[PDB]
Point group: D2
Chain length 309, copies 4
């Protein structure tokens, strides 16, 4: 089973920091995409087209596409597993948006959760995912507003609000919140469920993200959000058969538009300060290779390589 946790820290003075874990089995690489880029939602099906208003830094698995990123307006979008997802009922003839590019679409076109949601609520397109793939999304902007987007029984389901700070895997959000409610009756200092189960991670992330210091000093908030992410990670290679362990973590400082990243296998936290990056149309695509064991450190803009994408 897969395991991913996402948690938004809401601090003082617009300090908004989003942490995310990726647990699989992932072949992740990082890409910088200048704005004004030209994209289509599908390669076979009838789609929708767009040219990207905002540049973005994103992470992508080989077979998953864009699954995490921040755009230059500091909007963060994250695609996490939700096995019961059902994107449409049989006979859906809308334009198709590939599950692998859905995240990019969001990061390319929206600066605000409010606009992301207003657009998605039109239901212009449907999400298309190949059979032999089931994911929900969480989006948060720099005001700290968040939307959780799920497809259940072919129907669109959205929760929007600052209070929706955590997301994990199953069950569907409405139910996940009830499980969290139950555990809050118990009290996080008395007992927390300590397992790698989707709902246990939700409860711990939700408890700790609200317990870390209310600070606006990124030197504190970032490593704090990171220690929460570490608490809800799945210890490495955990088999006890094929349990999904944490491979990487990311933390997006959405105030200062900085994107931190660490690998469970590689020693250090590195990052990409988006304020030091050229997102102008002609700047050209760049890439941080991670699949070759590369070991980055500190600011990694320097280590960006050019890519013909």
């Amino acid at each position: 089973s897969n395991a991913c946790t996402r948690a938004v820290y809401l601090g003082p003075d617009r300090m908004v920091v989003t942490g995310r874990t990726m647990d699989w089995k992932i072949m992740s690489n990082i890409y910088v995409f200048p704005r004004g880029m030209q994209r289509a939602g599908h390669n076979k099906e009838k789609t929708v087209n767009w040219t990207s208003k905002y540049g973005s830094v994103i992470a992508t698995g080989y077979d998953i596409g864009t699954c995490d990123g921040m755009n230059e307006k500091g909007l963060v979008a994250s695609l996490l597993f939700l096995p019961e997802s059902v994107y449409s009922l049989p006979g859906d003839t809308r334009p198709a948006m590939g599950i692998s590019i859905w995240t990019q679409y969001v990061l390319d076109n929206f600066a605000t959760v409010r606009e992301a949601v207003d657009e998605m609520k039109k239901e212009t397109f449907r999400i298309d995912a190949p059979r032999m793939s089931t994911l929900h999304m969480a989006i948060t902007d720099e005001t700290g507003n968040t939307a959780v987007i799920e497809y259940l029984d072919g129907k669109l389901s959205i929760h929007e609000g600052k209070e929706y700070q955590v997301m994990t895997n199953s069950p569907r959000y409405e139910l996940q919140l009830a499980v969290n409610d139950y555990w809050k009756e118990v009290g996080g200092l008395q007992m927390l469920p300590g397992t790698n189960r989707s709902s246990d991670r939700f409860v711990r992330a939700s408890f700790y993200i609200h317990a870390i210091p209310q600070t606006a000093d990124a030197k504190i908030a970032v490593p704090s959000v990171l220690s929460v992410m570490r608490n809800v990670s799945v210890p490495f290679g955990i088999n006890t058969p094929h349990i999904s362990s944490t491979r990487w973590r990311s933390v997006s400082d959405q105030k200062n538009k900085v994107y931190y990243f660490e690998s469970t296998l590689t020693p250090n936290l590195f990052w990409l300060d988006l304020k030091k990056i050229d997102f102008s149309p002609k700047a050209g695509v760049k890439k941080l290779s991670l699949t070759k064991g590369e070991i980055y450190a500190g600011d990694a803009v320097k280590d960006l390589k050019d890519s013909q994408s």
Copy 2:
């Protein structure tokens, strides 16, 4: 309250790796001590003297002294809090060994848990700790044997064996094991206690340390043991008043005599390969300063500074 966790990974082909967390409130610095060094157990009381047979790499708090280290025979000694500790009854007239130097004594004089224990069982000296300080020790050698040493009601208490892989804070070891036994009846895949409580950390460390992959590849075992340590860390600045959060982690590869170290505040894992270090009598004391926010990376022998100690 304080919080520290320690866990020994026992792998194939003598792969022995010891992880340790330090949670406080710590002013830790790291020191390399050449062998043949000359030391006394106390500065006021009648003591015992020794000259160190083995060199060692150790970590020390300002007001605590040596609280963690590995010697060149790959023996690891760790001093963790145990609030109910009582070192002697009133009227104890033995030579006094300072609590702040007890760990060093062990690392200086022993290559094997077997010899450490045989010596301590003589009860030649008593442990002396100032009033306004309560600690137990765990020792493990490169054969993966471990001893847990506690003082309860002024009496020496030792558990020796490979199976004693985990240690935390209260209660006393015999009782800690019973709590762990209870939680194993429940099953770590079904439920784990997920709190920062001393016994919860014990149960999770004990479960995960046995669940990570049985490998002899340090490139795997080390980061694995580290992810266990991260699971039992206390998220940063956790207040919910004055709860003790993880400040640093250490991991001792006792097969390859390498000593890894990370700070919850500083980005990266660094280390000191003891095979690249001169422990010969005249080599002179060296130090890694950590109290000034220093940010180390990879091998940090290069960054060692000379120290007049």
Copy 3:
């Protein structure tokens, strides 16, 4: 806070047995109502009227009215607390059905959950509850079908099916099921939540009701269902301030139309075999007084007193 648990045992060969606890602070008495009785839903408001098709045995609190009973078709209806209940929005002009008589209405007019539900789905009337009162209902017939009826934000909410065997207090049913789902992932033999909390009782009742022997021998099923009810009772006078402890239990054998009853304060289980009771229109109302400490035993039809109601 109040606490009530209800659980339906589904056995072989139409063995259907419903257990129910009543925890309060209750002044309960038991009444036998011949059929063809004439009733109105309210004493002040515009209501609906009916004459009862089926006789029934019911329990009633002084200030609550009919809160539990079985009718001669073996249909069982139970009113349990649900604090978030909201029966209508402001400006509701429908005929009003008193919360105190809602249960009786159900028992008087329906032999089958299917018909109860079909009628309620018309939403002809609204439920009226005085301010300074919040309850949901569960109904099950002799085929073992069950409906759970709740009013949330003034809207009617129903779950119908044999699988809906348990009901407790908050949260709303959809969410209660999610909490139960979570605890089933954990496994009832590994861990059960053991508290008097509404959701803990749900989880234990749900686990045990499915674990007791599949038998059609009432000599076994009844005492079994009773031992489940005893497991989810709240120990007496539990204060640790004003916690609601179990005062009585009831168990309805819906196959043999027998109604068992015990008081936490009084030694024995007694019952009323509905097959030995005259429900014909002229038979007249009868009553088992419980508020005077009466101690009944075995068959208590003999102890029935006449009542001018």
Copy 4:
């Protein structure tokens, strides 16, 4: 596995009430033994002999002997399973006391826990239990003092004190207390372990026995202690293969020397008021048969039958 729970309620004004559950698979019957009776500890081995100073009411299984009772000084003795029990090492040549009569010996000869313990501390005899049987005992007198007696690795182990109010099955008492300590850190209103496991029952009994009302009114204390016993009972026929479910409960009012008893299979609580019983030497042995499904109620002295024992 077997399951038994025992819990002592300590109330105001010498109100001392001991509850006990019996879970097996039991063929229990109840016996009244006049004092001045003549008994030997074994039928084959070299034993010890005595003539009973106090009369007693006791319960006995077919193949277990005396496993629960109260004597006329209101002293209560209970034999519960402890699988790790080891009564002696090989080569023990002391007089042998049959495990089946050990309890009777205690009830026959002691009025006070203080004297029971002082005698047992001599270790005059050893406990003898046939191979193809492992039990610990708890004793409490009318001052509310209690002793827990266990044999571990052939050694006698005793805990004596008013605070030792609860006993269950494994692990050994010292360890059982640690598990209970852990769960008290968590808090019984926040979470209780709700399983039929030996330690879960200990924790719930220990929590609730201290939470029920502090009263000296037996009309309250007795049914209260009973509701605690019901909470830690094992629901009937629980299989989910061969799990041991509660068959009977007993409650000993040690202030008023009354002995209450109920069967999970039989409707009512009955009792034997020892103040209405003739324990004088010539009175003759009497018996309450329970193995034939007998259904008793209220005072059952009347139902006592004579027995040639």
